[PDB]
């Protein structure tokens, strides 16, 4: 059996060497058969097979045995993969010295040159002693696939990988704390590196692949508000094109655009509608996409009383004339208490065009008393153009469309402003983002470079709840997370004036969690019966407490954010003072942290960041740490994903011992349990949460989800202070 090498030279097969590596990789794993792997891969060998191909074959062999019954194959495959990547980058298993590596990469143009200016060779020597390359042996197969696929520095054309996981982690840390005083700089670098290398803190895909390289584009979320004017419509559109070329998710508020038929310039023109403009936003969003579908996503918001709401509600409906359909954008309907009350009483809802009702739109977000006043006034005013619809009809039309597409989202505007970090009089929250978890203030532009406009941006990350022993571990973790992301806000580039304005003014952050499901599993709690309410309350109090502590400490050191005076925090108001009171009936856990000490310290020294927390979905970050995604229950014990190399399988964390503890997604009898946990989480979260709603046809008579049930769950969510609602999953069975 002849073997061919990298230079294309022939050597004789050495089956004992292969076995050694397999043995190595298996160390410490349970229920994995080395022979099983050898049988399956040896049969595909042949005379003159390249060495790389042998590696791929054994890797896949291992990978194909991943299962619930033997989840440690995930690691057998992983380690084999890691081994192969080491040799692929360094030409041996052992990684080079940090300094040598960085020098080589800087010379090749793969790493930023500032790294060498910012740190001395002695400092790089010191950093090398922090690194633990044996941490590469703790990844799961799925995780290594992601790492190799979209994180590790590489040549996309030639397929060459230039680095390994541990250099990624150390250098990310290096970059983010490069402007720190020399007395504390490396202390912070080591602590952050440990956090992320031992999976305690999860960082977003953009940061993970970019920080350390020459780029400066790290923005993933941008919220744009569009005024009712051709200049603003053009500005918005221009802004989206710039941002989607750089991979940012976009949240667009286009609620002010006047309705179809409305007058233009007087009576010399009569509006064309919003649809046309919506279609213009869609092409802007998809402007940097392969073909015109792929990547670049956006969620467009509008009030429920808009005059064109019935046409807006069915924009993604897959059945209709092309000129009345904007299918490739998700929508977020904005509701408030008044609208829900009309439904409960079986009354009508009046539809108005924003241009015809002075003060109404603003009141909708910042003052519910004033909104009701104005709203009833204008209903009776006969000079105002309006339309009446039955609240049950509108809610069902909306819910039918949300049920069938899964992508018609809700946003409770009152909850977003009565319980938030911002003062609604000065900086109201009028929209959300792509995934409905960000909620930041925005101002319309009159031109792309308008400096008086405001585009919201948000930097994200997350805490791995399955990697901490006790909740007081979150103090260190919050320090590292806040400090690193605040440094990033000054590191990255801002293509549009208005976006820099918001980032430097308010320095807003969005830190959330991953691995919730696993966490609940190991504490013997479930989602559906209410058994996790108090633990969730305890857990989310810790997270918010320590995050505010971190941000507050940072403000002492480096000054609060410019526009800190527009926050409720500035007035001594806290998350615990404005939450939805109904919550008291479903959770009795006490506060365990000193919120009153903190209240005073915030008032006095302020916050570096106007917002700190936001619960977001995560697929890719969770994969790297073999964690359940965000706060959602797994759909099953094993995840299957498609790849060029083969089928990727990932087994939920500690399946061996917790299989009966988990509560799979379709096992829950309803949404109540989960909706209560979201409510409890929203007590303490600055922004919002990407809540889902899930329905299974086979649990209902005749396999049809009753509208009654859909409306009931909507109301429940409103009752416990839920700000937004993301996807609606319906089962395919």
């Amino acid at each position: 059996l002849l073997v061919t090498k990298r230079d294309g030279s022939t050597e004789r097969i050495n089956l004992d060497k292969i076995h050694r590596v397999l043995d190595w990789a298996a160390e410490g794993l349970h229920n994995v058969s080395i022979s099983q792997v050898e049988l399956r891969s040896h049969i595909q060998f042949y005379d003159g097979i390249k060495t790389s191909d042998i590696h791929e074959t054994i890797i896949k062999a291992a990978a194909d045995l991943i299962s619930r019954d033997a989840p440690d194959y995930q690691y057998l495959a992983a380690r084999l993969a890691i081994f192969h990547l080491r040799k692929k980058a360094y030409g041996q298993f052992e990684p080079p010295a940090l300094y040598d590596h960085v020098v080589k990469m800087v010379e090749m143009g793969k790493y930023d040159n500032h790294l060498l200016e910012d740190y001395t060779e002695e400092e790089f020597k010191q950093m090398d002693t922090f690194i633990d390359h044996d941490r590469d042996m703790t990844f799961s197969y799925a995780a290594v696939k992601q790492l190799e696929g979209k994180y590790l520095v590489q040549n996309r054309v030639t397929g060459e990988i230039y680095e390994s996981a541990q250099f990624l982690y150390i250098l990310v840390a290096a970059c983010l704390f490069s402007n720190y005083p020399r007395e504390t700089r490396l202390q912070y670098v080591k602590r952050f590196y440990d956090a992320v290398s031992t999976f305690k803190i999860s960082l977003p895909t953009p940061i993970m692949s970019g920080v350390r390289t020459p780029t400066r584009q790290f923005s993933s979320c941008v919220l744009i508000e569009c005024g009712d004017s051709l200049d603003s419509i053009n500005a918005t559109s221009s802004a989206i094109v710039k941002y989607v070329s750089q991979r940012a998710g976009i949240g667009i508020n286009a609620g002010r655009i006047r309705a179809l038929g409305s007058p233009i310039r007087g009576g010399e023109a009569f509006h064309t509608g919003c649809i046309p403009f919506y279609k213009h936003f869609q092409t802007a969003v998809k402007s940097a996409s392969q073909g015109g579908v792929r990547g670049g996503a956006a969620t467009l918001f509008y009030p429920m009383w808009h005059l064109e709401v019935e046409s807006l509600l069915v924009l993604k409906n897959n059945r209709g004339v092309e000129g009345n359909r904007v299918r490739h954008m998700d929508y977020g309907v904005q509701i408030n208490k008044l609208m829900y009350t009309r439904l409960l009483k079986g009354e009508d809802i009046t539809l108005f065009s924003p241009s015809d009702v002075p003060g109404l739109y603003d009141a909708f977000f910042a003052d519910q008393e004033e909104f009701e006043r104005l709203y009833t006034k204008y209903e009776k005013d006969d000079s105002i153009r309006k339309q009446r619809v039955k609240a049950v009809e509108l809610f069902s039309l909306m819910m039918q469309e949300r049920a069938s597409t899964g992508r018609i989202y809700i946003q409770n505007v009152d909850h977003c402003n009565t319980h938030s970090p911002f003062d609604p009089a000065i900086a109201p929250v009028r929209q959300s983002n792509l995934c409905l978890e960000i909620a930041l203030p925005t101002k319309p532009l009159n031109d792309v470079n308008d400096e008086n406009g405001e585009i919201a941006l948000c930097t994200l990350s997350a805490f791995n709840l399955g990697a901490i022993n006790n909740l007081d571990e979150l103090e260190e973790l919050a320090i590292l997370a806040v400090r690193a992301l605040d440094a990033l806000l000054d590191y990255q580039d801002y293509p549009i004036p208005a976006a820099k304005r918001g980032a430097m003014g308010r320095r807003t952050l969005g830190i959330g969690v991953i691995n919730f499901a696993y966490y609940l599993a190991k504490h013997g709690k479930r989602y559906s019966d209410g058994s996790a309410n108090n633990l969730t309350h305890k857990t989310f109090e810790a997270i918010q407490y320590y995050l505010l502590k971190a941000s507050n400490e940072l403000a002492k050191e480096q000054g609060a954010c410019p526009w800190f005076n527009e926050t409720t925090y500035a007035k001594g108001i806290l998350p615990i003072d404005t939450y939805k009171k109904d919550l008291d009936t479903i959770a009795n856990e006490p506060l365990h942290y000193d919120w009153e000490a903190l209240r005073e310290s915030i008032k006095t020294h302020g916050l570096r960041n106007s917002t700190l927390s936001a619960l977001m979905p995560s697929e890719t970050s969770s994969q790297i740490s073999n964690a359940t995604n965000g706060i959602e229950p797994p759909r099953g014990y094993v995840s299957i994903k498609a790849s060029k190399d083969g089928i990727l399988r990932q087994v939920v964390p500690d399946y061996e011992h917790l299989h009966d503890a988990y509560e799979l997604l379709w096992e829950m009898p309803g949404n109540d349990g989960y909706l209560q946990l979201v409510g409890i989480m929203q007590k303490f979260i600055d922004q919002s949460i990407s809540a889902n709603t899930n329905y299974d046809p086979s649990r209902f008579p005749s396999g049809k989800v009753p509208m009654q049930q859909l409306l009931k769950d909507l109301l429940t969510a409103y009752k416990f202070g839920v700000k937004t609602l993301y996807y609606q999953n319906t089962r395919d069975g």
Partner: peptide, 16 residues
Amino acid sequence: QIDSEVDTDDLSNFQL
């Protein structure tokens, strides 16, 4: 599949 049947008399009691 959904069953579009809304009972407004049942929802009316709900407290927001």
